[PDB]
Amino acid sequence: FVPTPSVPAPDIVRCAYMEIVVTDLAKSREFYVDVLGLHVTEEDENTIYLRSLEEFIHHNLVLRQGPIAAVAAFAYRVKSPAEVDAAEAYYKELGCRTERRKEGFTKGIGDSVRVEDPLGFPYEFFYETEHVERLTQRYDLYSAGELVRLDHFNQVTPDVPRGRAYLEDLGFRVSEDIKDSDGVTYAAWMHRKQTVHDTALTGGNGPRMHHVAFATHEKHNIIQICDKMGALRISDRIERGPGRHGVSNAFYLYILDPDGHRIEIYTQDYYTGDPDNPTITWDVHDNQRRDWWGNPVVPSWYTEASLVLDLDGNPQPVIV
Amino acid sequence: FVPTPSVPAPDIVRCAYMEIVVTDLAKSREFYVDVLGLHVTEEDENTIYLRSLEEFIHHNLVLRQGPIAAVAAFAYRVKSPAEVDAAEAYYKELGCRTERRKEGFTKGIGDSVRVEDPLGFPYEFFYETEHVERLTQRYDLYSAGELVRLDHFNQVTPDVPRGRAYLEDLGFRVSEDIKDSDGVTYAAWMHRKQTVHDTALTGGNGPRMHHVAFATHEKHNIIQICDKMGALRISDRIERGPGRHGVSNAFYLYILDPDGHRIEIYTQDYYTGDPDNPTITWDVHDNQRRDWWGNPVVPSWYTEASLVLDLDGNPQPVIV
Amino acid sequence: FVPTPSVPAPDIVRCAYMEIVVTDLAKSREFYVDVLGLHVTEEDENTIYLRSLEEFIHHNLVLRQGPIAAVAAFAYRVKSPAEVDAAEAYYKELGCRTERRKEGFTKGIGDSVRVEDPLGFPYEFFYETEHVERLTQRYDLYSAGELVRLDHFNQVTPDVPRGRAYLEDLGFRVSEDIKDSDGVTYAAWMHRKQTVHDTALTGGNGPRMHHVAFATHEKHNIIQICDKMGALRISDRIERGPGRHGVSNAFYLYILDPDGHRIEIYTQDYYTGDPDNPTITWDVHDNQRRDWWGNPVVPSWYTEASLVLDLDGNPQPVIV
Amino acid sequence: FVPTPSVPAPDIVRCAYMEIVVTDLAKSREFYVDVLGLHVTEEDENTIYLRSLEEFIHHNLVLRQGPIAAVAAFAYRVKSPAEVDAAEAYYKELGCRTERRKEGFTKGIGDSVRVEDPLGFPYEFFYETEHVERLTQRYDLYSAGELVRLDHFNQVTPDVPRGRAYLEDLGFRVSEDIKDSDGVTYAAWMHRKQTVHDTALTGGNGPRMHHVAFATHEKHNIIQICDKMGALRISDRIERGPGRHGVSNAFYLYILDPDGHRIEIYTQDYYTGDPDNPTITWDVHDNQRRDWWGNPVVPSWYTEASLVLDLDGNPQPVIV
Ligand SMILES: O=C(O)Cc1ccc(O)c(O)c1
Ligand SMILES: O=C(O)Cc1ccc(O)c(O)c1
Ligand SMILES: O=C(O)Cc1ccc(O)c(O)c1
Ligand SMILES: O=C(O)Cc1ccc(O)c(O)c1
Ligand SMILES: [Mn+2]
Ligand SMILES: [Mn+2]
Ligand SMILES: [Mn+2]
Ligand SMILES: [Mn+2]
């Protein structure tokens, strides 16, 4: 197990954005903006800043042109400027490499610290961000498959029990998990905000990014995304779903972007804000734990996932 | 009563399109295309031809620039070219003014006959029409408030029993009506196709066009139209609804175009195709006959309606 | 090809009901009434009469206890009493075995003729039926997965071109078909009523019943059926879907009853009522013709189908 | 203004339940259970404990038989057992009457303190409660108009600025408010949990309970409630809506129980959890602040509200 530091954990409010490296920016823009309908906060020749309909912070996604498709950062917003200091101190005590930039690492974000965490993932903690027009009631812009908010990340790592105790120490609570009779954790859903999760851990070769997920208001919005992809003849990019998750109870869809990064569209989970919210444990042999409808899980869903970068911009080696 | 001709009635398949005269074409285009999302089949400086998502005939609506906002024609498609002849013969026997144009009255329509019917309405019967791309599966074009097909017309006339017997002679059947204890008809819903109606008769000063109605696939599409109008700050053009009709059982919305013409958006009525489909009779005092939820009916809904034109292009005088 | 008779074909209005033989009536009742929510018109120790929410004829399904699960009759309603005579005369001229019963074959149905048609299927034609309370507006009964009407049948037969030419002589029109470069029909969707089909032909070992289909009002009603089956732990009975069909454009779901008979839940196809409604032809190699989202079909969907009975109640041998 | 205590405010997690006094328990049960579909946790001859689908604490509503219809308690769950002590200390310092019961005031709740707060409202704070089966995935129980969770309370008070400053000292944040050019608050929406509100203040004769609100998953669930009430002939109990709120952005419906207590059914507001979540201020003359579609409000909605009880069970006099 990762040691529990003597300094307090930073107070994390929620997952906020992900910075992903793509190989052809124009091709990626077409998928994220023209197909999925995300809103462009701002952009230049090498970077695109996107946000969902109900977001007020500067962006939920940063697309950056690069030679190797990978995830550069999983960013979490902390409760106040002092928590950025707490985050840096906490990881330094763990012996992790850290880098602080008062001016931020991405446009629209202020003082931030990035770290190569104990599991090899590039994590960012920040508090300051530029506010932009919240498009919540801009129904003149509302598309039939509208993505309304960023919900969670999903990470692949070889040792799930080690990762779980580490995120618990950081203050995340386990709303649901999958265990065997021995009591060993195979996967866990973890949260700071009042939904089922901000991040999840899946067992496998890693560190790797399994997916980032956005929510819609209703189920028909998810169906429309599939319909539109069939009309555009890119239905081969629909990987799994739509279906109903056993774990989380969310109606879901997983699609692939042009570099193969996995995007989940999700809707309707439940409230986990209470202090003694009951953890739901599923047995590893329960056939409805993944797909409530018993649908077959595609093999690629367990084996393909995105590389993540270290703080110098190079891929972290995958432990097999 | 209007005499029953000795020649057979033309075989009418369904309501097909309406030609409306608007006072400012650019302002009307903005409402029908930019706000409601109808598809432009073709257009020129004085006329716009629009169609709904699942239509394959040339248009469901013709917008024509004119000095007086009014309805120029209610058009019905007949079963074969010979029914156009039958339509002309039938109205001639009734002594109505008729005009036949082998080349059609509107672009994309072939051989047609227009008549000033016994109630003063300009009716058109045609069979030939140019086919265009049916957009049924063009989900890349599907908007959140998509109108998928033209459903029916609604006409205001002073003597409903006279109008009902006249349309029955034409072969329309009454799926639902409103009567008093005396057995007198106050309103009637009439159809040729297998839905609740192609046209309806409402008692009042006329001849006048009460509304033309389009259908959506689901209820949330109707809600989105309201939401979008609120975002565009034109919610004062929402006249009545959304609500549930007692008569027809349809979920509905009535909005007003820039000249005040009333448009209904409707969804989910039931099948009436069987030969002995039961007529549903509602009593005039049943409070759920109009709005199933008991909502208040706006006074303007009973008093405002559009003028209709005679065959020379002049308004038919309204009998009060 | 089946010869074309010299007498006119009976005027068929729509598919009306199917008589199914089940092996354990209590187990079947639980699935059709308690799980699917169909409404019991009446029942006895050996037979159950069910109807959908918006139906006014006596029943859409008849469940009958028997030794071998099979389909005893595909019933179509004809336009008037005289069409029952025309149906008998038409099949006698084709040399088919026919049996007429003035008092009907199932309760609530009057004068009917049943025939072993040229492809081996037991077809029934009737006009008279007892009317029952139409539950259209009984929202106090409306369930979250409500089936509102019977839509179509799907039949498996070894020679599709023969069956297609036969049904067209009967007056059915082809709304969509699947053909190869050579022009050979592999499958066809055929209709009398104004929807995509009343019956369809699938190539395979037959004669066999592939499925009977019911419609819901909206897409979320179909999703609820799946959710409820997962809660009841019978998700292993969901065979294919939910998905979007390329042919027909309908949102769909296929599930299996206790004896393995296949039921489709379907919603939202389009209007085919015009006399020149364009047939849509799909190529055999178009991967979006079955499932618009490119989902894998299930081998069982092409190989498993129900036996049908001859007029003496014995199963028709299946040609392989 | 109410003085700000020197002891810290209790850490409040969310509104949790309301205790309502009804005049005929059988008539009320019929409305809450048979019509609305709430789930009975337990009941006796004089009291009914109800909860929503996704709730795990003992109840969200308590119905209690009594001589005068009124609200006996607005209950909030606090973060830990120690916060019950902090709540008692905070209100004692304000000079409010308080009553603590180690064994709870209603079944299933533990150590609780009730207070007659500065505005005259009976507030309860508790931590301990019995957990019951969370019905989240019991789709075999899911109704077409299912209420999934308790969302908020709305209170009527004569001095909104006083009440607002008081609740902010308690730690509630203002997600949206209505102000005039002068900066005076006419109404405010306040929250502890990550939705738009836990409670709201409406100006008027009070103290009175304006309404308690429950959420559904989707917009069609709210429409079904209306449809079912029309089928049961109790549409006269639908008071306002359905509509879209400007403030909060939620799709809504207000109905009346047998004693006239107002219930809101609500769905789809947005996330307010960030520490600098922007307050949205609406001007008093903006006609889309209440109903986004410009619908007329109902005078009864501003004038009628429920009496609330003091700690001895007698109604608090209403200041006019
Ligand atoms: O279906 C599964 O594989 C489990 C599950 C539940 C919720 C999620 O967001 C997710 O990504 C995966
Ligand atoms: O609500 C009403 O006034 C009756 C009604 C029913 C169906 C319709 O299309 C319509 O336009 C009016
Ligand atoms: O998806 C397919 O396999 C083709 C298809 C289309 C419409 C139907 O009703 C059906 O039963 C099958
Ligand atoms: O429409 C209004 O009157 C304002 C409003 C907004 C959100 C709510 O929950 C509410 O109860 C009232
Ligand atoms: Mn996920
Ligand atoms: Mn209408
Ligand atoms: Mn089918
Ligand atoms: Mn409210």
Automatic annotation (TrEMBL), chains A, B, C, D:
Molecular function GO terms recorded: dioxygenase activity; metal ion binding
Highest rank taxon of the organism: Bacteria
Keywords, in A-Z order: Dioxygenase, Metal-binding, Oxidoreductase
Keyword Cytoplasm: no
Pfam families for this protein: Glyoxalase
SUPFAM superfamilies linked: Glyoxalase/Bleomycin resistance protein/Dihydroxybiphenyl dioxygenase
Signal peptide: none
Domain VOC: from-to ranges: 14-128, 149-268
Binding site for Mn(2+): H152, H211, E264
Protein name, as recorded: 3,4-dihydroxyphenylacetate 2,3-dioxygenase
Organism ancestry: Bacteria, Bacillati, Actinomycetota, Actinomycetes, Micrococcales
